[PDB]
Amino acid sequence: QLIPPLINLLMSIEPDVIYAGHDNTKPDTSSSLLTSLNQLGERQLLSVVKWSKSLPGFRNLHIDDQITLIQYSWMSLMVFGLGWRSYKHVSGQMLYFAPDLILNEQRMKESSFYSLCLTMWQIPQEFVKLQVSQEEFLCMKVLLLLNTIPLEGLRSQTQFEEMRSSYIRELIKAIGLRQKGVVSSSQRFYQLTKLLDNLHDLVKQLHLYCLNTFIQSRALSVEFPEMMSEVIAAQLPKILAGMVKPLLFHK
């Protein structure tokens, strides 16, 4: 009754928790972990498609465009909510991939991925640091779904731009529910938008990591599943060559 109505719909359409189905039983090797991660990733991109089909405005873009923006955000979405969920249930002090897959410091001993898990870990730190609320989270995550377009833009640019705007303004709502300044509320906005502007670069490291484990998978002994494989082949190279338009909040 103080929660703006979209922010309650955001609540409700949020997915239920996805397990990794991870054997836990026997001792992690670095291929098995990598493989669970993926299976877990598969189950999360199904959940993103479902999620997108109820989010107000997503389905009145052109099919294509809806396919392009998911293909283009799924890493950045995955990473974000590992943030979120790490921050919410383990104090940002452990990486909460899933209920059945939680990584403490021990566990990323075997590197490959030690270094990368450091970098994933930045996000739940910044959330702890910023004391990010649920409402602001719901709104910035839609923002990352709308964060990057083709260099030639979208088929439904205009609706796009409308939808982006109407969720930038939903975030100024949420920011509003607690930062009652006009000074503070501003700086907060600034801060919640640099935070997003910042996960580009962090993402381009997952990205480059995910393609080279892709490509060396057979060497590596790492199974990628089908849905995950297709978005990687489809967009990752192109993304990684910087043949996409990052939307910036700041200059």
Ligand X SMILES: C[C@]1(O)CC[C@H]2[C@@H]3CCC4=CC(=O)CCC4=C3C=C[C@@]21C
Annotated binding site for progesterone: 85
Nearer to ligand X, 44 or 68 (CB): 44
Give the DSSP H/E element, type plus range, for residue 78: helix 63-89
CB of 159 closer than 8 Å to CB of 104: no
Give the integer Cα–Cα distance in Å for 93 and 81: 15
Torsion of CA 111, 116, 120, 121, to 10 degrees: 50
Interface positions with ligand X (CB under 6 A): 34, 37-38, 40-41, 44, 78-79, 81-82, 97, 206, 209-210, 213
Shortest distance in whole angstroms from residue 64 CB to ligand X: 24
Nearer to ligand X, 31 or 156 (CB): 31
* Token pair in block for residue 11: 């609540």
Helices 63-89 and 134-145, packing angle to 10 deg: 150
* Token pair in block for residue 179: 């930062």
- Least Cα distance to 244 among 213, 216, 203, 211 occurs for 203
Shortest distance in whole angstroms from residue 222 CB to ligand X: 8
Nearer to ligand X, 78 or 239 (CB): 78
Shortest distance in whole angstroms from residue 189 CB to ligand X: 26
Nearer to ligand X, 20 or 139 (CB): 20
Helices 226-240 and 184-215, packing angle to 10 deg: 110
DSSP state of 250: -
Nearer to ligand X, 38 or 148 (CB): 38
Shortest distance in whole angstroms from residue 128 CB to ligand X: 17
Give backbone dihedrals phi and psi of 12, rounded to 5 degrees, phi first: -60, -30
Give the integer Cα–Cα distance in Å for 188 and 156: 30
Shortest distance in whole angstroms from residue 38 CB to ligand X: 5
Shortest distance in whole angstroms from residue 192 CB to ligand X: 20
Nearer to ligand X, 154 or 203 (CB): 203
